[PDB]
């Protein structure tokens, strides 16, 4: 089953030099600090909070609408500060997501209506099924589904996730073409 068409009106999007397609309605905060590596899709009502720490995001990742990327807060012994958030290449974040993960690897897929606890670490090629909460300090190993409330390991992904996911994200970018201005 190929990725279906998903058209957008060209007026409320910004296409950048690197190829990032960031929606106008997305709430970018501290945009001087945010870094997108190109070919990124940030949909409407996305609250990317770069005003607290470095929020770097990899290539071809998709951040669906109404999703918040907020870097976590860590209380270390020497004092207090905000940990920078890092997201790898080819990450598919579904809508209505809440992300407080310290690190999200590459080839990751977060299900819709998901909340990720503070300072979580998501290794590469992991899935989180829909309507799932990951409490803080939860480490998802590669090739595992973390589902339920709380998210518990309840399966393993197929072998070819590194290939399937990079196909899916590329198809999503290639099929996210602007509406016909007729």
């Amino acid at each position: 089953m190929e990725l279906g068409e998903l058209l957008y009106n060209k007026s409320e999007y910004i296409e950048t030099a690197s190829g990032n397609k960031v929606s106008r309605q997305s709430v970018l905060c501290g945009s001087q600090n945010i870094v997108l590596n190109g070919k990124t899709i940030v949909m409407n009502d996305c609250i990317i909070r770069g005003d607290l720490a470095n929020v770097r995001v990899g290539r071809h990742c998709v951040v669906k609408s109404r999703s918040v990327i907020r870097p976590p807060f860590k209380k270390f012994s020497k004092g207090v500060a905000f940990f920078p958030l890092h997201i790898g290449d080819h990450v598919f974040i579904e809508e209505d997501c809440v992300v407080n993960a310290a690190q999200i690897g590459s080839y990751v897929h977060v299900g819709k209506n998901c909340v990720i606890g503070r300072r979580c670490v998501l290794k590469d090629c992991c899935k989180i099924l829909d309507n799932t909460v990951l409490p803080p300090e939860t480490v998802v190993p590669p090739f595992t589904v973390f589902s339920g409330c709380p998210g518990l390991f309840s399966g393993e992904l197929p072998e070819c996730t590194q290939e399937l996911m990079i196909d899916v994200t590329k198809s999503y970018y290639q099929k996210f073409l602007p509406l016909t201005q007729v």
């Binding site: 950048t16 030099a17 690197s18 001087q32 870094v35």
Partner: peptide, 15 residues
């Protein structure tokens, strides 16, 4: 690295 603010400014310049 090219910060997202720089890309937004370049897009504004293009318009």
């Amino acid at each position: 690295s090219t910060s997202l603010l720089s890309e937004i400014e370049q897009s504004m310049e293009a318009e």
